[PDB]
Design a protein around this ligand. Structure first.
Ligand SMILES: CCS(=O)(=O)c1ccc(Nc2ncc3cc(Cl)c(=O)n(C4CCCC4)c3n2)c(C)c1
Lengths: 278, 296
């Protein structure tokens, strides 16, 4: 079974909080084969769309959490549909990001920016149509635990101090962005959806640390993550060869917060290197 | 929406009109939150997306139940369970005799059961005010209007800077704190608790600052010893009026000792010392577990 990594919580009961989180990992399903419902689509098309959403996120200083919400909304929406044509993918992705930004950001960009970045491919009204199509097809289940939120949990446990206050941010920035960069690479490959989000985050963490740390912060046993770890090896290789990106700073964002902002990597070639090795 | 007959408008909450209405098939009585969408430049507003998605996750006897979400041409209806009135109209209808104190055990206990559930699900309500507190005829009382709620992360980051209706807003917010989480909801409940007894708002501020000073007058102006950090908070001014912690029998007489204890632990200045919803449930004060039918 799974260890309970959370400390004693002053604000609620750690056992209840953890069991709720684990049930969130159960009721939100992802399907590594959903593109088989779309015979005109290829996995590279998904990678190109998601990579472009990362670019849009960086231009607008959106949170990592917003990107991963959009990624999850896109993957689960597409699993509810059939026979989507490639000319619709931009609209589905940008509307997923619009929903996610409205959920997650304090002051999100306005509708007109989400249309603007598509460079004429999508109008505002088209985005308003698609957002309703997405939310209804997902039955309004719009509160997943994203990949990056699992990484946030793990980092907080890892650097818990005397205070046992898991809600105030206590982890250093560089480790967070480096693991995140590996996850941003992996998520571009639809095969990642084979692994639960908490195992993807634990496996990326592992490739940047040790089994001791992985088990300490996630409660997984090595056999739980072994296949994911093995799958991730070439992506970790490509990142290590290329070297980790440095912390960027952002206009209007305090430097101590800048690690929370999604960055963009021209890493579709990295993705190809990683998959070529298999 | 052919299966719903609107009875009467019930009021406007955080977004759009609420209606009393009847399920034509079963005769069930429901509240209908309407959202007109062609009024909205951004499509489905973020408050509605948050409320719907949070309430699909939250099923508790002390949280109003979201029954359905219906989309018709330019409109979005949220079908909720029916309750009978908010606590602000109940309070002020019983504002002469006061509200009998066994119901104030009942209502503060149930409200804490709800909030403890929200917080274990990592949801901040951020608008616990009696107009959003529904109490029905069986007596139960339910948290409602999650239009201002937010799921908080582990760890949190900076969220929306001015939240909770002013009479219920916590001091850390008024001073522009970088981080807040569950304490802000507990504060709100204290303001409501004393508002039940005094049958009058504990801090009926007319302004941001007036709300701050109502708090200082009643609890004493805080300092680096009662709340370590106050002096380094953004909206802290040295010029504030040093006031005295008026005994917890003046600011609120009907209370016994435990009522004073609980309430003061809920109005602790330091969010990090302030009591959790779980702990408030374990306070002696909730040893007699009364559940009276109200007058309506
Ligand atoms: C002038 C107010 S009153 O006392 O006449 C009155 C108040 C409440 C209710 N009932 C009720 N039942 C279920 C919901 C579900 C939701 Cl989501 C909701 O928002 N509200 C209301 C709360 C805030 C505005 C709408 C509900 N209200 C009634 C019948 C009268």
């Amino acid at each position: 079974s799974r260890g309970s990594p959370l400390p004693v919580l002053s604000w609620a009961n750690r056992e209840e909080v953890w069991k709720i989180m684990l049930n969130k990992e159960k009721t939100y399903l992802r399907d590594q084969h959903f593109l088989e419902q779309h015979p005109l689509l290829q996995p590279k098309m998904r990678a190109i769309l998601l990579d472009w959403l990362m670019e849009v996120c960086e231009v607008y200083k959106l949170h990592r959490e917003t990107f991963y919400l959009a990624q999850d909304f896109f993957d689960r929406y597409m699993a509810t549909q059939e026979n989507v044509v490639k000319t619709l993918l931009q609209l589905i992705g940008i509307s997923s990001l619009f929903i996610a930004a409205k959920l997650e950001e304090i002051y999100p960009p306005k509708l007109h920016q989400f249309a603007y970045v598509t460079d004429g491919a999508c109008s505002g009204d088209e985005i308003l149509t698609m957002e309703l199509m997405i939310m209804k097809a997902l039955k309004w289940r719009l509160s997943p635990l994203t990949i990056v939120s699992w990484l946030n949990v793990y980092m907080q446990v890892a650097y818990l101090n005397d205070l046992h206050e898991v809600l105030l941010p206590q982890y250093p920035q560089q480790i967070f962005i480096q693991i995140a960069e590996l996850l941003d690479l992996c998520v571009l490959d639809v095969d990642c959806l084979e692994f639960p989000y908490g195992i993807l985050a634990a496996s990326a963490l592992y490739h940047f640390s040790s089994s001791e740390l992985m088990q300490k912060v996630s409660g997984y046993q090595w056999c739980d993550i072994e296949n994911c770890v093995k799958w991730m090896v070439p992506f970790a290789m490509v990142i290590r060869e290329t070297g980790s990106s440095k912390l960027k700073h952002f206009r209007g964002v305090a430097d101590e917060d800048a690690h929370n902002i999604q960055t963009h990597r021209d890493s579709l070639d990295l993705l190809d290197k990683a998959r070529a090795k298999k | 929406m052919e299966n719903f007959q609107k009875v009467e408008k019930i009021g406007e909450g955080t977004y759009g009109v609420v209606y009393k209405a009847r399920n034509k098939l079963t005769g069930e009585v429901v509240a209908l939150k309407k959202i007109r969408l062609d009024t909205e430049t951004e499509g489905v507003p973020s408050t509605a997306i948050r409320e719907i998605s949070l309430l699909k996750e939250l099923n508790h006897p002390n949280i109003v139940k979201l029954l359905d979400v219906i989309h018709t041409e330019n409109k979005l209806y949220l079908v909720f369970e029916f309750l009978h009135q908010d606590l602000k109209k109940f309070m002020d209808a019983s504002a002469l005799t006061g509200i009998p104190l066994p119901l104030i055990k009942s209502y503060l206990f149930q409200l804490l059961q709800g909030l403890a559930f929200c917080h274990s699900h990592r949801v901040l309500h951020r608008d616990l005010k009696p107009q959003n507190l529904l109490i029905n005829t069986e007596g139960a009382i339910k948290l409602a209007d999650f239009g201002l709620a937010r799921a908080f992360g582990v760890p949190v980051r900076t969220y929306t800077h001015e939240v909770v209706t002013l009479w219920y807003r916590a001091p850390e917010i008024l001073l522009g704190c970088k981080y807040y989480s569950t304490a802000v909801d507990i504060w709100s409940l204290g303001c409501i608790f004393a508002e039940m007894v005094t049958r009058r708002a504990l801090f009926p501020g007319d302004s941001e600052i007036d709300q701050l000073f109502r708090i200082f007058r009643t609890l004493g102006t805080p300092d680096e010893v009662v709340w370590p950090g106050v002096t380094s908070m953004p909206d802290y001014k040295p010029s504030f009026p040093k006031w005295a912690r008026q005994d917890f029998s003046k600011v609120v007489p009907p209370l016994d000792e435990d009522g004073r204890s609980l309430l003061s632990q809920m109005l602790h200045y330091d969010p990090n010392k302030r009591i959790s919803a779980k702990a408030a449930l374990a306070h002696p004060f909730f040893q007699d577990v009364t559940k009276p039918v109200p007058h309506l």
